[PDB]
Motif scaffolding. Structure first.
Motif, PDB file in Angstrom:
ATOM      1  N   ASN A   1       7.454  -8.749  10.390  1.00 42.06           N
ATOM      2  CA  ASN A   1       6.388  -8.425  11.312  1.00 42.06           C
ATOM      3  C   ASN A   1       6.291  -9.607  12.262  1.00 42.06           C
ATOM      4  OD1 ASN A   1       5.363  -9.927   9.176  1.00 42.06           O
ATOM      5  ND2 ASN A   1       3.263  -9.279   9.579  1.00 42.06           N
TER       6      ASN A   1
ATOM      7  N   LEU B   1      10.633  -2.871   2.144  1.00 41.27           N
ATOM      8  CA  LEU B   1      10.014  -4.117   1.732  1.00 41.27           C
ATOM      9  C   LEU B   1       9.925  -4.179   0.217  1.00 41.27           C
ATOM     10  CD1 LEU B   1       9.096  -6.471   3.376  1.00 41.27           C
ATOM     11  CD2 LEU B   1       6.833  -5.481   3.523  1.00 41.27           C
TER      12      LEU B   1
ATOM     13  N   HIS C   1       8.896  -4.330  -3.418  1.00 37.50           N
ATOM     14  CA  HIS C   1       7.776  -3.803  -4.218  1.00 37.50           C
ATOM     15  C   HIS C   1       6.922  -2.846  -3.396  1.00 37.50           C
ATOM     16  CE1 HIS C   1       9.197  -7.268  -6.371  1.00 37.50           C
ATOM     17  NE2 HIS C   1       8.203  -7.367  -7.230  1.00 37.50           N
ATOM     18  N   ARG C   2       7.454  -2.372  -2.274  1.00 31.83           N
ATOM     19  CA  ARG C   2       6.773  -1.431  -1.400  1.00 31.83           C
ATOM     20  C   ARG C   2       7.440  -0.079  -1.519  1.00 31.83           C
ATOM     21  NH1 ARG C   2       5.027  -6.614  -0.658  1.00 31.83           N
ATOM     22  NH2 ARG C   2       3.244  -6.620   0.765  1.00 31.83           N
ATOM     23  N   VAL C   3       6.654   0.976  -1.367  1.00 35.92           N
ATOM     24  CA  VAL C   3       7.150   2.163  -0.685  1.00 35.92           C
ATOM     25  C   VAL C   3       6.764   1.991   0.774  1.00 35.92           C
ATOM     26  CG1 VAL C   3       7.617   4.147  -2.138  1.00 35.92           C
ATOM     27  CG2 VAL C   3       5.292   3.194  -2.028  1.00 35.92           C
ATOM     28  N   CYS C   4       7.589   1.270   1.532  1.00 36.25           N
ATOM     29  CA  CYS C   4       7.220   0.874   2.885  1.00 36.25           C
ATOM     30  C   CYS C   4       7.182   2.081   3.813  1.00 36.25           C
ATOM     31  CB  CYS C   4       8.199  -0.170   3.418  1.00 36.25           C
ATOM     32  N   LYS C   5       6.476   1.926   4.935  1.00 32.27           N
ATOM     33  CA  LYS C   5       6.050   3.079   5.724  1.00 32.27           C
ATOM     34  C   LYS C   5       7.189   3.692   6.535  1.00 32.27           C
TER      35      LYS C   5
ATOM     36  N   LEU D   1      -0.971   2.067  -3.833  1.00 32.75           N
ATOM     37  CA  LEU D   1       0.404   1.952  -3.376  1.00 32.75           C
ATOM     38  C   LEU D   1       0.461   1.160  -2.079  1.00 32.75           C
ATOM     39  CD1 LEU D   1       0.757   5.725  -3.296  1.00 32.75           C
ATOM     40  CD2 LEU D   1       1.139   4.429  -5.250  1.00 32.75           C
ATOM     41  N   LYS D   2       1.285   0.129  -2.041  1.00 26.24           N
ATOM     42  CA  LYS D   2       1.419  -0.692  -0.854  1.00 26.24           C
ATOM     43  C   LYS D   2       2.206  -0.014   0.253  1.00 26.24           C
ATOM     44  CE  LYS D   2       1.396  -4.420  -3.694  1.00 26.24           C
ATOM     45  NZ  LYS D   2      -0.065  -4.556  -3.553  1.00 26.24           N
ATOM     46  N   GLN D   3       1.891  -0.404   1.485  1.00 26.25           N
ATOM     47  CA  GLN D   3       2.626  -0.037   2.687  1.00 26.25           C
ATOM     48  C   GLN D   3       3.022  -1.305   3.418  1.00 26.25           C
ATOM     49  OE1 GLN D   3       1.824   3.950   3.616  1.00 26.25           O
ATOM     50  NE2 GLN D   3       2.391   3.293   1.573  1.00 26.25           N
ATOM     51  N   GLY D   4       3.480  -1.211   4.646  1.00 26.10           N
ATOM     52  CA  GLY D   4       3.844  -2.403   5.378  1.00 26.10           C
ATOM     53  C   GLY D   4       2.657  -3.074   6.017  1.00 26.10           C
ATOM     54  N   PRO D   5       2.928  -3.942   6.975  1.00 22.62           N
ATOM     55  CA  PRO D   5       1.855  -4.500   7.789  1.00 22.62           C
ATOM     56  C   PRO D   5       1.408  -3.543   8.869  1.00 22.62           C
ATOM     57  CG  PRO D   5       3.524  -6.070   7.464  1.00 22.62           C
ATOM     58  CD  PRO D   5       4.102  -4.805   7.007  1.00 22.62           C
TER      59      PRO D   5
ATOM     60  N   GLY E   1      -1.243  -8.444  10.999  1.00 23.20           N
ATOM     61  CA  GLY E   1      -0.216  -8.174  10.041  1.00 23.20           C
ATOM     62  C   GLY E   1      -0.921  -7.828   8.777  1.00 23.20           C
TER      63      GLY E   1
END
Lengths: 110, 48, 43, 120
Positions: free
Chosen positions: A40, B37, B39-43, D102-106, D111
């Motif tokens: 980012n 990312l 440990h993510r299910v990143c977007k 559940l995590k996502q990005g920034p 951020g």
RNA sequence: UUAAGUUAUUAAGGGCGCACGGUGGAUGCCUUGGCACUAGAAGCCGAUGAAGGACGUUACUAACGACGAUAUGCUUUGGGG
RNA sequence: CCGAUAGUGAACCAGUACCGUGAGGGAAAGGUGAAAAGCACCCCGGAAGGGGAGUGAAAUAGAACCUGAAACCGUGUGCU
RNA sequence: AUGGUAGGAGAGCGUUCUAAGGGCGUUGAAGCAUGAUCGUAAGGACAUGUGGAGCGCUUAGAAGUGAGAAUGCCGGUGUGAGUAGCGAAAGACGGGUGAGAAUCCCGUCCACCGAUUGACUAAGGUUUCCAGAGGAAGGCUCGUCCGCUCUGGGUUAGUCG
RNA sequence: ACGCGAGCUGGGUUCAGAACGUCGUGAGACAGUUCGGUCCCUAUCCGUCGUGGGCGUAGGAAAUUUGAGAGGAGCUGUCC
RNA sequence: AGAUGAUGAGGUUAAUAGGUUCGAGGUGGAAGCAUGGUGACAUGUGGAGCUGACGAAUACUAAUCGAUCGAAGACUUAAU
């Protein structure tokens, strides 16, 4: 065999774009794209568009296979700056700096 | 608040050696999609 | 705080402006100076 | 406990609004600090709904907002009614738990770590 | 199996060389706008509107000309093709 | 002889931007043509590129066709 | 036998022309900017770039002649930090739209002003008003608004002023 | 720097007001009293407490303790 | 334990660490029903909430397959 692309007068200051340009230098194009996706920073999407443009150049115009390519050079030059007067402080000037981003990609062969 | 002497090129760049970005994580997408990312299910294409 | 220059249209036309400058001889001299310099606005 | 960058009243108001919208919608997306705080709030609410009597219904009214829900087949319930009616029936065997993060990005403008908190 | 000597292996930085940036005018150019000579005026108008402008006018419209509601011009004499 | 910090403040949008209530003060910026022939055409992202293409006797001669230089500053390579 | 910020009479160079002579030059000639020569000079004769049509040498004369500072002036340029600051106030979630949303639109809840951060009329300002569509700049974001573009525009009085 | 105001105060002195004694023809003076009276700075080439990354590192390397001192901490006293 | 980084407790046998849920410890008398009172109220039903910060149970919780980093023992010299 080398393909390149430049993006000219990109409105990010060059110090901020050289930081993430230092990540992808000398790596493979696929893992370079992955590094650009997981940072980012404001300039990762710009640089990623220049990198995809250079890989498209290599595939279309020189018929290089895009799975062997490494990022040979990646750098940022200063473009022309724009001078703004800040009204918000007391009459001191603010330069909008801009940059030129060049990427060249290659297969390491001759 | 003021500097007596201007700083040179070499002192400026000696100050900037810790001022840089660390390399990100990358646990790779095994089902489908781009690498996400850690440990993510990143977007964008997350198949953790 | 209150400033110098509080505008007013009638006052502005009355202390400057064409008929006030043509009404005295020194005023006609400012319009002659401003013509001779080639100013776009005489008053 | 966390302060979330707010004064005491603002923080209480924000947590009540967060818990109400999670009851409405069953998964919401927020920042990671906020969801780590709303875990506890909504889990004690679901506990009160499972307990089920009048005294805990009155305790649960202290926290939920008075929000109307347009239900399928055109009906309507409040969130206190959905909590003591539907959600309390799903979790009658499960002892604790009830929320997953559940995590996502920034985000793009900061951020900030986005996160989805969901009911299980 | 002991005492001893020694070097790299980062160049973050240094000097040299390389190569694309920013920058802006060193070279050449210009001569559109005046120093001065000659000549001519006559200094120059109008109570026939004198003296600088304001609004307008082109098929299309944004500053000067025409000056002007006959308006991006009208008649006439002579050049000219 | 001015050769354009110029006889001129102004050979470009000049007594104009702008500044000042007003008297007044007062800039910057000039520069094909060999011929727009100004990248049809055509291919990957809006800007910008990479290719070919060109009137191109020559586009790192692309709107900064007066070319066009330097230095400050750069920035990426490297030899020690 | 042979130093001196003040001293005299010295030989020399960049610009220009005479006043000339003699050359380099449209199979290229530059100058200028990057090259091994000349050197105390100042100042000029052969590898890149430039272009792409301008300069030297010799002798003599004339000087907008004569280039490290003046808290010099500026066509001016560019540095010295990712530092200070981002101008009082409560927002949260869902949907939508999009190339892309802490930002734009709709919704619900919450909140703030409430002798006012409400509603009118003056002065003042002068198209900012309303619709569409891209915003290359503008806004201490983005456009995916207006205060850029196009018009589509848009201001109606016997009694109001 | 009668240690210490880019650590703090501003009572004193002394700047514009004002008054009394005294001197001066006067404007004013004395320093004699008296009441009132704005004290800036984001810490840099640098020099000055705490807390990290690496040039080292000589078997590969990693987990388990020197005590030279660079050392630092001085700790005083009264009544039964 | 902490400005950050460092330190420490720990991570798919893994509860581990945190949350949760049941607990208790410690801090401060309910709702409902009934009875009495004309009413304000009182009393009984009987140490209710908390657990916000002080035990057990858990997979709610992460690492997806995770991936990455990290030698070829000097040499010599003489002392076996």
């Amino acid at each position: 065999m080398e393909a390149k692309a430049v993006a000219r007068t990109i409105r990010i200051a060059p110090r901020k774009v050289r930081l993430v340009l230092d990540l992808i230098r000398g790596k493979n194009a696929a893992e370079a794209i992955a590094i650009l996706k997981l940072t980012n920073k404001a300039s990762s999407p710009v640089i990623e568009k220049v990198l995809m443009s250079a890989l498209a150049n290599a595939e279309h115009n020189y018929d290089m296979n895009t799975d062997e390519l490494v990022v040979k050079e990646a750098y940022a030059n200063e473009g022309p700056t724009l001078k703004r007067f800040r009204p918000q402080g007391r009459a001191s000037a603010i330069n909008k700096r801009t940059s030129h981003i060049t990427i060249v990609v290659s297969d390491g062969k001759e | 608040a003021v500097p007596k002497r201007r700083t040179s090129k070499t002192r400026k760049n000696k100050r900037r050696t810790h001022f840089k970005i660390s390399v990100p994580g990358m646990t790779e997408c095994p089902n489908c999609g781009e690498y996400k990312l850690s440990h993510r299910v990143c977007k964008n294409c997350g198949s953790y | 705080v209150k400033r110098t220059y509080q505008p007013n249209k009638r006052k502005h036309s009355k202390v400057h402006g064409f008929r006030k400058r043509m009404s005295t001889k020194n005023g006609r001299k400012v319009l002659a100076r401003r013509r001779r310099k080639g100013r776009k606005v005489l008053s | 406990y966390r302060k979330l960058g707010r004064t005491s009243d603002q923080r209480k108001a924000m947590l009540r609004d967060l818990a109400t919208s999670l009851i409405i919608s069953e998964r919401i997306e927020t920042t990671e600090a906020r969801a780590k705080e709303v875990r506890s709030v909504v889990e004690k609410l679901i506990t009160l709904g499972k307990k089920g009597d009048l005294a805990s219904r009155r305790n649960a009214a202290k926290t939920l907002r008075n929000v109307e829900i347009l239900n399928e087949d055109e009906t309507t319930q409040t969130a206190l009614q959905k909590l003591f009616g539907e959600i309390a029936e799903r979790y009658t065997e499960r002892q604790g738990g009830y929320t997953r993060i559940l995590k996502q990005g920034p985000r793009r403008g900061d951020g900030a770590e986005s996160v989805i908190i969901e009911l299980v």
